[PDB]
Amino acid sequence: MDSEPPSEISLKNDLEKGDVKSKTEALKKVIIMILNGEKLPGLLMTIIRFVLPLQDHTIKKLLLVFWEIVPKTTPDGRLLHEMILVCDAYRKDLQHPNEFIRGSTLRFLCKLKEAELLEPLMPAIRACLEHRHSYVRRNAVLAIYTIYRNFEHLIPDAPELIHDFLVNEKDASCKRNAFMMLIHADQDRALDYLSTCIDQVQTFGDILQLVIVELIYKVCHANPSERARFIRCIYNLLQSSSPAVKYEAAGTLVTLSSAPTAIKAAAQCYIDLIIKESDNNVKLIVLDRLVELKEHPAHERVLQDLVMDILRVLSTPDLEVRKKTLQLALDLVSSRNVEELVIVLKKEVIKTNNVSEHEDTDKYRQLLVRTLHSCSVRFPDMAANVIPVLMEFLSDSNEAAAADVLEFVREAIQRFDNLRMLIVEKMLEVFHAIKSVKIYRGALWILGEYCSTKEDIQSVMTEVRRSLGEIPIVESEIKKEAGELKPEEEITVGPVQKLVTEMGTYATQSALSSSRPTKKEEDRPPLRGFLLDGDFFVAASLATTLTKIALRYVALVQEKKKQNSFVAEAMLLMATILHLGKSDPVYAEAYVHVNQYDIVLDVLVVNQTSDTLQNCTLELATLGDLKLVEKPSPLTLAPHDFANIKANVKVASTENGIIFGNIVYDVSGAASDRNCVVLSDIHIDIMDYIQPATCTDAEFRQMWAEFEWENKVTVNTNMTDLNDYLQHILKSTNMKCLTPEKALSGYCGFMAANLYARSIFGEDALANVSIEKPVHQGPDAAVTGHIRIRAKSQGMALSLGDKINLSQKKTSL
Amino acid sequence: KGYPEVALHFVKDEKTRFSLALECGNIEIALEAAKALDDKNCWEKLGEVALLQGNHQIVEMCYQRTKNFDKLSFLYLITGNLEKLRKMMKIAEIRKDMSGHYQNALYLGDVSERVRILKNCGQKSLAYLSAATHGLDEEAESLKETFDPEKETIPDIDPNAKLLQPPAPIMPLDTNWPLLTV
Amino acid sequence: MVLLAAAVCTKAGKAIVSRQFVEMTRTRIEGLLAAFPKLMNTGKQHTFVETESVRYVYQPMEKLYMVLITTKNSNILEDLETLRLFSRVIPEYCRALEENEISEHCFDLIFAFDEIVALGYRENVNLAQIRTFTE
Amino acid sequence: EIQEIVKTGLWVGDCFIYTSSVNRLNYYVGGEIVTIAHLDRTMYLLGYIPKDNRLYLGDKELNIVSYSLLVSVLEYQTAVMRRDFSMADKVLPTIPKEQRTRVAHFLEKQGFKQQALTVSTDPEHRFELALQLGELKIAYQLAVEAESEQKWKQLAELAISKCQFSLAQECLHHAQDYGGLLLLATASGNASMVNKLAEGAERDGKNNVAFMSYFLQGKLDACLELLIRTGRLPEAAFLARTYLPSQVSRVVKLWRENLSKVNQKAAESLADPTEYENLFPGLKE
DSSP, rough: OOOOOHHHHHHHHHSSOOOOHHHHHHHHHOOOOOOHOOOOOOGGHHHHHHSOOOOOHHHHHHHHHHHHSSTTTTSSSOOOOOOOOTTSSHHHHHHOOOHHHHHHHHHHHOOOSSSTOOOHHHGGGGGGGOOHHHHHHHHHHHHHHHHHHHHHTTTTTSSSSOBBBSSHHHHHSSSSSSSOOOSSSHHHHHHHHHHHHHHHHTTHHHHHHHSSSSOOOSOSSSSSHHHHHHHHHHSOOOOSSSOSOOOOTHHHHHHHOOHHHHHHHHHHHHHHHOOOOOOOOOOOOOSSOOOSSOOOOOSSSSSSHHHHTTTTTTSOOOHHHHHHHHHHHHHSSSSSSSHHHHHHHOOOOOOOSSSSSSOOHHHHHHHHHHHHHHHHHTTTTHHHHHHHHHHHTTOOOHHHHHHHHHHHHHHHEEEEETGGGHHHHHSSTTTTTTSSSSHHHHHHHHHHHHHTTOOOHHHHHHHHHHHHHHTTHHHHHHHHHSSSSSSSOOOSSOOOHHHHHHHHHTTTTTOOSTSOOOOOSSTTTTSHHHHHHHHSTTTOOOOSSSSHHTTTTTSOTTTTSSSSSSOOOOHHHHHHHHOOOOOOOOOEEEEEEEEETTEEEEEEEOOOSSOOOOOOEEOOOOOOSSSEEEEOOOOOOOOEEEEEEEEEEEEEEOOOOOOOOSOOOEESSOOOSEEEEEEEEOOEEEEGGOOOOOOOOOHHHHHHHHHOOOOEEESSSSOOOOOIIIHHHHTTTTTTTTTTTOOOOSOOOOOOOEEEETTTTTTEEEEEEOOOOOOSSOOOOSSOOEEEEEEEESSSSSHHHTTTTTOOOOOOO | OOOOOOHHOOOSSHHHHHHHHHHHHOOOOHHHHHHHHHHHHHHHHHHHHHHHOOOOOOHHHHHHHHHHHHHHHHHHHHOOOHHHHHHHHHHHHHHTTTTTTTTTHHHSOOOOOOHHHHHHHHOOOHHHHHHTTTTTTHHHHHHHHHOOOOOOOSSOOOOOOOOOOOOOOOOOTTTTTTOOOO | OOEEEEEEEEEEEEEEEEEEEETTHHHHHHHHHHHGGTTTOOOSSSSSSTTTEEEEEEEETTTTTEEESSSSOOOHHHHHHHHHHHHHHHHHSSSOHHHHHOOOOOOHHHHHHHHHHETOOOOOOOHHHHHHHHH | OOOOOOOOEEEEEEEEEETTTSSEOOOOOOEEEEEEEEEOOOOEEEETTTTTEEEEEESSSOOOEEEEEOOOHHHHHHHHTTOHHOOOOOOOSSSSSHHHHHHHHHHHHHSSSHHHHHOOOOOHHHHOOOOOOTTTTHHHHHHHHSSSSHHHHHHHHHHHHHHHHHHHHHHHHOOOOOHHHHHHTTSSSSOOOGGGGGGHHHHHTTHHHHHHOSSSSSOOHHHHHHHHHHHHHHHHHHHHHOSSSSSSHHHHHHHHHHHHHOSSSOOOOSSSSEEESSOOOTOOO
């Protein structure tokens, strides 16, 4: 009988039957239905009658079982007395020669904090005063303590009965087996006795002595219990810069992340921390101790650095461990992050050296070039390293492989003015075999800026200019680029001037030069030719032309703040980006009142009628996410009764199977068809059910992408900013205004709120409230705001859309 | 009602009573509501409102039972009491509120109050400097002798220059701030 | 009490047999055991996993969870050790875990629970000790 | 008796270089065990062949691995053991960064905090040695007057202990420590350097810190002002009455006005004695 709540009639029958097995099974079936929480008092006389005196342990044990989980509730066969049918003949049970029945009886009897059993539990310590097992003596210290807990904090429970009444706790210390139920409030002499016992311990018993009294002067003295306290005590005597090298903490710690890569990744972190405490700049974070595994002697054999190499990773162990490991290389050794990121990047970025680090997918290659290159932009020393490695990247000599390479290096030159003169000659080489945009773009920029340095350019450019591949974006990049630097410093059959001619043709003009350009018609609609066409005031010469622009870098460009940079090593970053970091007539009148922060729905129940409505009961219901914190409890609604009855309200619950409308309120009365009527007290909305939750800009952005929010409305009374009406109203449809999606200035400055919720509707809810408050001569519609809304199938989107207008209720009875 | 009218009529809730009191500005009723709200926070907030109506007797009582003996210590020369100011010093001594017990010695013309409190803190240096300057070099010396000596040292503050202040020239204090009340 | 309940669960969505040492967790016992042990106590194949602010210690046996729950704790070794001793005692009564056979020996298991953990404090048990009681 | 167990060992002079079951290569000097280097794997000392300039180790392999013995470290430490601290300092130019701090810590353990201070690269180790020596001045330079407040708080306490109040007042200033700094400082009786370190306190609601600063020789230095700043306007009125330069009339007014704005109507205050509070003609000396 797993859980069957109607079966009590059969149990009575089964409980006495003249067959002992049946009786045991019955009583067992009662236990299992109560434990789940089901019907049990009908049976009581039957249950109690067979078992009572006997020394036959199994039925007695079963009855003994049922007296610690419901004795108080059941009363057919027990009623209320001092020597109840729980203990009257269980004084026999306590005083049987078999330890088990006595012991069991003692154990339940003393366990209860019952006051209708207080006297019978007190000399119940007799059953276990003699200690036939470790179990008997432990059973005794726990039972005396449980007696002490049960209203006997004074002389009824404190001395000895004949050996224990609160003194097993003392005795246990010096006896062969220990266990101290003495944790609080008990004899001082036993506490003292436990200390002595630390030495003459029994190990289970030591965990009991130890919860009470901890800290040792020793190293130990033995056993897991003492050992477990000991690592706590050690952390005290050296708190300083974490544990560093984990103590006896290490054993539990592995299981704490049994799923399976995460342990190594964690372990790797600690091992890296431990090596050294470095400068602790941007991603140079290694704490713990400065010297404890050093770094870097030149006589150390086979050195520290061997372990450091693991941390430099491509994936060399698996991805979770990889992400931890790349950060960890950066963390022990660099200048900041820059130094060790360049080494690390050199390995990752595409080459002709190894083909286990090159790939023909263009974005990844490109990104890897940008990561290597960002280190230079960060720190100078890296410029010198980067440029020759970049030329190796080029040497791959696939159209695309060159292409990616050329694209970053060209950005580097914008930063690094006439420093990378050397690269230009390498960069031209792979520009001729071509099937893509990227190669043309980049090459034309290097060869263009670099012209003073070289003289090749008609020849290199011209094979490509009459070759094909994909050429949209090529136009833009060649347009600003081709002439640049020194007015007449090249010549192969086209000097720098031919280049300016070319540069202009490629931009949007027409001219025979480099055997004509591939295309002329520019990239995306805004860019066009014209700016540059106007430009080249002084023909490709460092002055105030293309050259200027080329040998200068747009805004601030420093660090790895992503200003001509990309922020570490490209593969590690994907993982970091991913991390969102999300945090019968009846009359009612009613108002909601709050006194001393108690929120209640006031209801007055009125019988305007002369007719009888007796049988009157009042209930507030649990609909779904609405709940009663206590229904109105008066038996009112009688002939010409006016009553004030208070129903307390909650807003947060779990969905019930009954209707999901406004608030259900139920009054009952006389009638047999409609004994229960549902009638209303004032408004509560569907919107309550939504649950508020919040987003950060990353979670908002991810969800924006994840599912559409095209749906918009413009809501009146969003004249005001985010903070005022809009927040308060948004709150009531369990929403909250978080992070921005705005871009403010002297022409821009709609207020933008990123909203989130996680509705109990199987959807989230998100929105952006844009408040069109004029920051221009031509506003949208002046003050008002357009709320762009969604939910996960946009079923709550709509709630956001209208619950940001207005919202107010009041009455004054 | 911010000038209680409706408020006067229903006042049955200990909270409504509390509210009523700040809206008048007469916190005599507040303290009782605050009492019946069984809460300290109310006593300190009504005590502050009390200081606002002007009278510090009412403030003292409240502030004493919220246990802001140190706020009181601060208030008290400002108020011009010296007898009450001493009561605060002792019952803030025990708390080791060093910006409570500490205040009052300065505020009376002689500094002796600090000297003992600081002795109990174990702040022997601070106790000597305070004492010495008032010309209570003997007490200053006691502190040095009980503890580490060396009293000779001259800090960025004086260690022996006169401390004397004439405490509160007012004969009726500002615990006795006059009022009529409308 | 430190130990709220000691419970044998079926992840059928119910507490098959369970023990409330002193009247506290009656119906409460079934809801906790029913939700949490279904997800492996929300575990990942880790003996300690804590969910809804209740420490669940467990061991899977078939579609069943033998579960120890605490919301307070005195020592690391101890919580496992009562569960462990329980796991010596449970196949003697029910031949592994299995809902029907667990159900039939509600009395056996329940009695062991009272004996093993008394007023939430982890006493010790053994298969021979268990015998005197069910004799 | 030495802490790290000797799995195998070798004598280089009277110094014992041994391997440990921790994989530590340590050397015994003085009855003290120092770690010369860390072994990454389990290694055994074949012998020290002067030719190679090396100690020859072998793994499980009947092949060679080599560790040169770190003689400069060993000689620094050995000299320290002998109680030839100066001698060990001659070695120091050829002890790097963190190693100088470590060798310094060796010097210190054996004794002489100061010689350890000169060799220790790390300023923090110098700073602590200076507290230990009781060299307040040296510890003071090491903190450095602008910031390093943690250094200064340790120094300030040390200065109060020695009852050298002077160094203490400066440490507390650099520390800032307004609450603590005031306690040492307001013992003045002339308020000589107590206003600065409580200027903030006035308007931070750290009024208490502020009142002690200003009222200390019968002067109203910024006593009143602290009270206005905080919004504890009643208290400024009250103070003004106390010392009667009859400034009360203005403070009571400003305050009374404040009652009318802060919802009082029955104690509204806008009168001269009618609506609770009392402007100066009600008041007196």
